Write an enzyme that holds these catalytic residues in place. Structure first.
Site, mmCIF file in Angstrom:
data_model
loop_
_atom_site.group_PDB
_atom_site.id
_atom_site.type_symbol
_atom_site.label_atom_id
_atom_site.label_comp_id
_atom_site.label_asym_id
_atom_site.label_seq_id
_atom_site.Cartn_x
_atom_site.Cartn_y
_atom_site.Cartn_z
ATOM 1 N N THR D 34 0.804 -1.219 0.000
ATOM 2 C CA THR D 34 0.000 0.000 0.000
ATOM 3 C C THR D 34 0.838 1.271 0.000
ATOM 4 O O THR D 34 1.995 1.271 0.431
ATOM 5 C CB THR D 34 -0.931 0.068 1.231
ATOM 6 O OG1 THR D 34 -0.153 -0.048 2.430
ATOM 7 C CG2 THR D 34 -1.970 -1.032 1.189
ATOM 8 N N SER D 35 0.238 2.356 -0.480
ATOM 9 C CA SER D 35 0.901 3.652 -0.511
ATOM 10 C C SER D 35 1.010 4.142 0.924
ATOM 11 O O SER D 35 0.106 3.926 1.734
ATOM 12 C CB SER D 35 0.104 4.646 -1.353
ATOM 13 O OG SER D 35 0.094 4.253 -2.713
ATOM 14 N N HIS D 93 8.099 0.573 3.971
ATOM 15 C CA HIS D 93 7.492 -0.601 4.567
ATOM 16 C C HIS D 93 8.678 -1.448 5.005
ATOM 17 O O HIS D 93 9.812 -1.245 4.546
ATOM 18 C CB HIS D 93 6.687 -1.393 3.533
ATOM 19 C CG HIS D 93 5.345 -0.808 3.229
ATOM 20 N ND1 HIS D 93 4.399 -0.570 4.202
ATOM 21 C CD2 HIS D 93 4.781 -0.436 2.057
ATOM 22 C CE1 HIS D 93 3.309 -0.077 3.641
ATOM 23 N NE2 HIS D 93 3.515 0.013 2.339
ATOM 24 N N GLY D 94 8.424 -2.391 5.898
ATOM 25 C CA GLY D 94 9.496 -3.253 6.345
ATOM 26 C C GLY D 94 9.029 -4.374 7.237
ATOM 27 O O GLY D 94 7.836 -4.530 7.505
ATOM 28 N N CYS D 135 8.006 -0.946 9.639
ATOM 29 C CA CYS D 135 7.565 -2.023 10.510
ATOM 30 C C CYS D 135 8.694 -3.026 10.722
ATOM 31 O O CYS D 135 9.619 -3.119 9.916
ATOM 32 C CB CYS D 135 6.340 -2.714 9.923
ATOM 33 S SG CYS D 135 4.874 -1.657 9.919
#
Lengths: 4, 245, 245, 245, 245, 4, 4, 4
Positions: D34-35, D93-94, D135
């Site tokens: 997701t953006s 993200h992560g 994350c």
């Protein structure tokens, strides 16, 4: 003890 | 470079500076002043203490009023450009605003004036410390049981710190065996905190040590069970740390 | 509990303490003393500054020498048991060791003596601060371009801090529009650093502010382009922070 | 000179250093990620914050895994001799030990390895800071109501500081309007304390701000009323102050 | 009272807290784990160090995985209301995220979970310190020559500090005669700075000591001339000083 | 509020 | 020197 | 500017  | 702050004196010059110790123990018979037993202990303690702080120590003993003035004049005329600060310790008899040469009095103002911002250019903006172990009178402390700007100039009286051994108007105590209460305490606190605390905080610890750990013992009721509180007089404009970088 | 240290004054009593501000602007014609224009700006600035530090501020205007002594006596006789400290600010004309009532002089020692460790028991061991905006003489600073123990007692002169606006023997400057150089600076530094720095360090910043940011402007050559350096006199035995826990 | 101490990193080099900000908002459709709405607020906040700390900021948007590796490699090959430190901020993200490029994952170790003491000589002995907003898993915090010597070498992993936005194994929260909880807090604390506190102490304030002032609001019970605590991982060998002298 | 600040943990409770030391030296033959010579030196050093910090020290030797879990569970179920903090030191073999009992592994998360903000109410808001001397993998460091609010809750992972002896993925070094590099250094720094510095700053000194003063000596080229850097992982929300008032 |  |  |  002594004073100056 | 990044954000810069100027709250502390630059103490990383090639040399820390001179530490002149004037130790007057024996006075001319005609003056009627008693010998200051224990003062050699103070002078030795100070020499070692300031040597460890990397000061160029110069010890002078039994100087006349003329010799004290000549010494101060000469020292103020030296090139202090490569020095971070200046320290002068006076151990002698005294009264309010006066220190005694072996043959007579010297006004403290006469001594300190040589180092004014306008009279000693190589020390302008640098801390000038005067440590004074001498009486400032004859009182005894009985104690108690517990817009505009331009042309940037600085005051000629700025950057001086006077660490008096006692409060204005009071006698100052000295033990013939251990040395003076103030110098004993000052050296102990410098040895323990010079690499940790700012100078005013070290002097505050000295105030507490002298105030709490010492009390006079005398067979004379007038001089028995007396207390002492040193007096820090600061005209400094920045924080002073003996260590750097 | 764990290791305990006693290097700072206990400032968490129910109350911070009293802040007595004596603002003398108008003097009796017979004394020949001029009105101190700008002093109301100082008094208001101090009231706000100490109010924010949680001090119980009491402002008194145009007090005679008799009224000043009576006020100090009465205040020293109050029960300060629940108070952490005591602050007294004197705004008036003066000379070395003297502050002026509207009709005559009062020795600073007479005022401070009421708060001695042995005369005001509820303040013993607590910091007693005297902020003095007054002349200490007539000099002008021209500036320069840049073992044993037992029976625990403390000295009766211990725990006093005298924040003088100027050096011994010097005039103190006051602007008729902005207030005195020292009080302006003191309030500014307390507002900015009281929740961060120890008091001596705040006063050192005040010294720098007064020393660098102010210079007199006068049509009279004798009083033109002069500088000023405040004088911190500390007999405190611990570090002083206005904040706690 | 006088006594010298080496407890703090030298931060007075000609330049503070580079601050590389990798802002990944839009991801390749095929990845299914997701953006990250609100991340531009973070990137702008960081740019301004580090600009004020005198860092040479370089903002990069929507980089693939290949572009991230190429960028890090190139930056590590630059001459950082005149720079005091290095800062890299990753916004994406992560999962544990991983940060996402727009088209796939990148091991955090691969990125940081370029700056090892033995691989980037011009940064050896200098602080290398990695700020990571991503994350580290899918856990949610429900919260609770209140001898020898020679050949002097240093570890290749020394002098790194990893300021993670969240605890190991946990999701990291980001507000679509205000930006991420961690970056919002980090910038606020740097703006207020960078000229006063040591970096670890600033990060501790960030921990408290995120821990106390934020709580998630969601229509989904699984993600509602959740908390977050950042994670400071230090392999630094000295104190870090953004200001100097 | 006056202005109040809440930047430091309250460490003046009646008791400092418990310091649990789990010292695993001998392992069950079936596990194939070697004896950890030198660990008794570490355990004794830690016992003395924390005893001086006024912690109630409990030393446990050679505990099985079951005994470790039972011990942690029981300790977390005690009433810590009158205690300022909690300390747990683990000395054993390990790998990333794991510590070894004498007969098998124990997940570090299983141990720390007992002390979560929601599982040990009497420790909520208090610092929980875990000191871990164990390997975190098999890597060797070759070194290099030199808005909204309401319902106040805190994260259940907040207020934990993990002082790892080595970086993630790396072996941790222990000398059979002097004890582990990390514990030797930690105890030395606590003894010297616990009454002066904040905990993170003490741990930073430990990082420097381990990083600069130690290097492995081995007849095996694979394990010779290796370095180590500890890893401070902080989820603390306030500054931690072992001393008070 | 969203997770990363 | 030994590893843990 | 005036003196006190």
């Amino acid at each position: 003890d002594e004073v100056d | 470079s990044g954000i810069s702050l100027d709250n502390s004196y630059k103490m990383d010059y090639p040399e820390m500076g001179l530490c002149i110790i004037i130790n007057n123990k024996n006075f001319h018979k005609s003056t009627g002043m008693t010998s200051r037993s224990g003062t050699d202990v103070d002078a030795a303690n100070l020499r070692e203490t300031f040597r460890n702080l990397k000061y160029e120590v110069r010890n002078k003993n039994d100087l006349t009023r003329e010799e004290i003035v000549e010494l101060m004049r000469d020292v103020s005329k030296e090139d202090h450009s490569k020095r971070s600060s200046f320290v002068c310790v006076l151990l002698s008899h005294g009264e309010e605003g006066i220190i005694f040469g072996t043959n007579g009095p010297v006004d403290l103002k006469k001594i300190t004036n040589f180092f004014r911002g306008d009279r000693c250019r190589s020390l302008t903006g640098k801390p000038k410390l005067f440590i004074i172990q001498a009486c400032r009178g004859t009182e005894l402390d009985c104690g108690i049981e517990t817009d505009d700007m331009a042309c940037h100039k600085i005051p000629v009286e700025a950057d001086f710190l006077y660490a008096y051994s006692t409060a204005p108007g009071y006698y100052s105590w000295r033990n013939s065996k251990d040395g003076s209460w103030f110098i004993q305490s000052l050296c102990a606190m410098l040895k323990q905190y010079a690499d940790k605390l700012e100078f005013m905080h070290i002097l505050t610890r000295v105030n507490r040590k002298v105030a709490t750990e010492f009390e006079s013992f005398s067979f004379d009721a007038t001089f028995h069970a007396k207390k002492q509180i040193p007096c820090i007089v600061s005209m400094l404009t920045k924080e002073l740390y003996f260590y750097h970088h």
